[PDB]
Design an enzyme around this catalytic site. Structure first.
Site, PDB file in Angstrom:
ATOM      1  CE  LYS A  82      -1.880  -2.386  -6.315  1.00 54.42           C
ATOM      2  NZ  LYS A  82      -3.021  -3.142  -5.742  1.00 54.42           N
TER       3      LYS A  82
ATOM      4  CG  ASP B 154      -7.946  -0.738  -6.551  1.00 50.43           C
ATOM      5  OD1 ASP B 154      -8.493   0.182  -7.207  1.00 50.43           O
ATOM      6  OD2 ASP B 154      -7.536  -0.598  -5.352  1.00 50.43           O
ATOM      7  CG  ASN B 155      -4.661   0.194  -6.754  1.00 50.70           C
ATOM      8  OD1 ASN B 155      -4.804  -0.830  -6.039  1.00 50.70           O
ATOM      9  ND2 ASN B 155      -5.037   1.429  -6.372  1.00 50.70           N
TER      10      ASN B 155
HETATM   11  N1  LIG Z   1       1.311 -12.358  -3.988  1.00 45.56           N
HETATM   12  C1  LIG Z   1       0.397 -11.969  -3.030  1.00 45.56           C
HETATM   13  N2  LIG Z   1      -0.532 -12.848  -2.585  1.00 45.56           N
HETATM   14  C2  LIG Z   1      -1.433 -12.542  -1.649  1.00 45.56           C
HETATM   15  C3  LIG Z   1      -1.359 -11.307  -1.044  1.00 45.56           C
HETATM   16  N3  LIG Z   1      -2.056 -10.685  -0.048  1.00 45.56           N
HETATM   17  C4  LIG Z   1      -1.541  -9.476   0.110  1.00 45.56           C
HETATM   18  N4  LIG Z   1      -0.507  -9.261  -0.785  1.00 45.56           N
HETATM   19  C5  LIG Z   1       0.378  -8.086  -0.878  1.00 45.56           C
HETATM   20  C6  LIG Z   1      -0.502  -6.820  -1.048  1.00 45.56           C
HETATM   21  C7  LIG Z   1       0.368  -5.590  -0.879  1.00 45.56           C
HETATM   22  C8  LIG Z   1      -0.497  -4.321  -1.085  1.00 45.56           C
HETATM   23  C9  LIG Z   1      -0.958  -4.192  -2.559  1.00 45.56           C
HETATM   24  N5  LIG Z   1      -1.695  -2.939  -2.808  1.00 45.56           N
HETATM   25  C10 LIG Z   1      -1.029  -1.786  -2.989  1.00 45.56           C
HETATM   26  O1  LIG Z   1       0.230  -1.741  -2.954  1.00 45.56           O
HETATM   27  C11 LIG Z   1      -1.786  -0.517  -3.156  1.00 45.56           C
HETATM   28  C12 LIG Z   1      -1.108   0.707  -3.160  1.00 45.56           C
HETATM   29  C13 LIG Z   1      -1.735   1.927  -3.300  1.00 45.56           C
HETATM   30  C14 LIG Z   1      -0.950   3.205  -3.275  1.00 45.56           C
HETATM   31  C15 LIG Z   1       0.156   3.332  -2.453  1.00 45.56           C
HETATM   32  C16 LIG Z   1       0.863   4.503  -2.415  1.00 45.56           C
HETATM   33  C17 LIG Z   1       0.464   5.567  -3.205  1.00 45.56           C
HETATM   34  F1  LIG Z   1       1.145   6.728  -3.157  1.00 45.56           F
HETATM   35  C18 LIG Z   1      -0.617   5.470  -4.060  1.00 45.56           C
HETATM   36  C19 LIG Z   1      -1.313   4.272  -4.112  1.00 45.56           C
HETATM   37  C20 LIG Z   1      -3.115   1.942  -3.450  1.00 45.56           C
HETATM   38  C21 LIG Z   1      -3.820   0.762  -3.477  1.00 45.56           C
HETATM   39  O2  LIG Z   1      -5.179   0.767  -3.636  1.00 45.56           O
HETATM   40  C22 LIG Z   1      -3.198  -0.476  -3.331  1.00 45.56           C
HETATM   41  O3  LIG Z   1      -3.978  -1.587  -3.401  1.00 45.56           O
HETATM   42  C23 LIG Z   1      -0.389 -10.396  -1.524  1.00 45.56           C
HETATM   43  N6  LIG Z   1       0.473 -10.740  -2.492  1.00 45.56           N
HETATM   44 MG   LIG Z   2      -5.888  -1.082  -4.224  1.00 43.64          MG
END
Ligand SMILES: Nc1ncc2ncn(CCCCCNC(=O)c3cc(-c4ccc(F)cc4)cc(O)c3O)c2n1
Ligand SMILES: [Mg+2]
Ligand SMILES: [Cl-]
Ligand SMILES: [Cl-]
Length: 213
Positions: free
Chosen positions: A142, A167-168
């Site tokens: 995020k 998203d989010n």
């Molecule tokens: N720089 C770069 N480049 C390229 C990449 N490819 C992957 N990544 C890293 C992605 C890491 C995951 C990101 N998404 C989330 O953290 C996420 C979390 C929640 C959530 C969690 C706990 C709760 F209690 C409530 C809600 C819900 C969501 O819908 C989310 O999408 C990159 N990074």
């Molecule tokens: Mg998400």
């Protein structure tokens, strides 16, 4: 095994090969009845579908594929010849995403790039033959929504009308990105209030349409 491997196996054993809608339903069933996972989910997914259908983008970039749920959701609605580039830096998740797309029969429409946005966005033009993007789905860390928006602009990847869909923006939240796009004359923003995937918790999508420098 991992939760992501369990999701993939569940799809393979409860969806129909080559049927994207069955794939989405299988993931959502698994994540509702068995183990929560950070897929965009059906509530926000329906808003995504409406946006995709409105714009019919020819070239979409996704940041943060995870298991490929949103990649399947978007790619199934793309017109013939339209393409999705989806970035996933976690190699184990990138392999799950590829196999998910393969099962769904969408592999010819999608290219899964295994690397970090900060490294890959500057390579898009030369290495992946991109001119400008029609739409970007932001779903990675995020704290990267704002820097990567600014990087996409620097790299000349946005045009008048490029749709950013984030998203989010409520949970976990992206406060710097929201403040920036909503305050900038270079974006026209709309908030779509919804629910966190698989939960009775408010979340939302932000659409931010780039208006040029
Ligand atoms: N720089 C770069 N480049 C390229 C990449 N490819 C992957 N990544 C890293 C992605 C890491 C995951 C990101 N998404 C989330 O953290 C996420 C979390 C929640 C959530 C969690 C706990 C709760 F209690 C409530 C809600 C819900 C969501 O819908 C989310 O999408 C990159 N990074
Ligand atoms: Mg998400
Ligand atoms: Cl997803
Ligand atoms: Cl949901």
């Amino acid at each position: 095994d991992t939760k992501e491997q369990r999701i993939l196996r569940y799809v393979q054993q409860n969806a129909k090969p080559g049927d994207p809608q069955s794939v989405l339903e299988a993931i959502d069933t698994y994540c509702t009845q068995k183990e929560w996972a950070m897929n965009v989910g059906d509530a926000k997914g329906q808003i995504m579908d409406a946006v995709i259908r409105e714009y019919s983008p020819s070239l979409v970039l996704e940041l943060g594929a995870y298991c490929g749920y949103s990649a399947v959701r978007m790619a199934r609605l793309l017109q013939p010849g339209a393409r999705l580039l989806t970035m996933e830096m976690n190699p184990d998740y990138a392999a799950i995403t590829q196999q998910m797309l393969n099962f769904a029969g969408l592999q010819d429409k999608v290219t899964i790039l295994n690397g970090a946005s900060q490294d890959l966005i500057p390579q898009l033009k030369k290495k992946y033959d991109v001119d400008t993007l029609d739409m970007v789905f932001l779903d990675h860390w995020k704290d990267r929504y704002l820097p990567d928006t600014l990087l996409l602009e620097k790299c000349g990847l946005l045009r008048k009308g490029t749709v950013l869909l984030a998203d989010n923006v409520i949970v976990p939240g992206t406060p710097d990105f929201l403040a920036y796009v909503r305050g900038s004359s270079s974006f026209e923003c709309t908030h779509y209030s919804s629910y966190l995937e698989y939960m009775k918790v408010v979340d939302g999508l932000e659409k931010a349409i780039y208006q040029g420098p």
